[PDB]
């Protein structure tokens, strides 16, 4: 019926990925579920989970993350999202250090932090021709 046994029991929708997620990048979300719960696809309609390993492919990181946020309502937490380039170039994305970004984990450095409030930003006229 389906290419892989771990795919959710989805009947296919004309809202899945397109030619872009065959030559630029595609995103895969994996998770393990205790029950074959019925959930709503980020793209189309209702799909059925597998009582075990579940693997879904999407065209955007936002679609995978919306599916994962929906999974949290099913008490599912072990979901992990990967980015796949045109060949099998798998990169773990969402649980980047194994801890969700909302929980503080040691080993993270601040990126994009300014040691002042908004009012300390430089005047644009002094940022001309650089």
């Amino acid at each position: 019926k389906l290419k892989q046994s771990d795919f959710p029991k989805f009947e296919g929708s004309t809202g899945g990925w397109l030619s872009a997620a065959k030559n630029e990048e595609k995103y895969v979300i994996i998770w393990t579920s205790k029950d074959a719960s019925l959930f709503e696809m980020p793209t189309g309609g209702t799909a059925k989970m597998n009582a075990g390993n579940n693997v879904a492919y999407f065209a955007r990181k936002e679609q995978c993350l919306a599916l994962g946020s929906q999974l949290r309502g099913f008490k599912i937490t072990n979901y992990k999202i990967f980015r796949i380039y045109p060949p099998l170039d798998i990169t773990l994305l969402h649980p980047f250090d194994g801890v969700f970004p909302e929980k503080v984990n040691q080993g993270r450095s601040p990126v994009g932090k300014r040691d002042a409030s908004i009012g300390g930003n430089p005047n644009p006229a002094s940022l001309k021709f650089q």
């Binding site: 999202i81 994305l93 970004p101 929980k103 503080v104 601040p110």
Partner: peptide, 19 residues
Amino acid sequence: TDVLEMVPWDGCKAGQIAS
């Protein structure tokens, strides 16, 4: 889209800052 994350800090009570 999982852009922001919480990282350790010492400038506030919570001891955390967004990154």
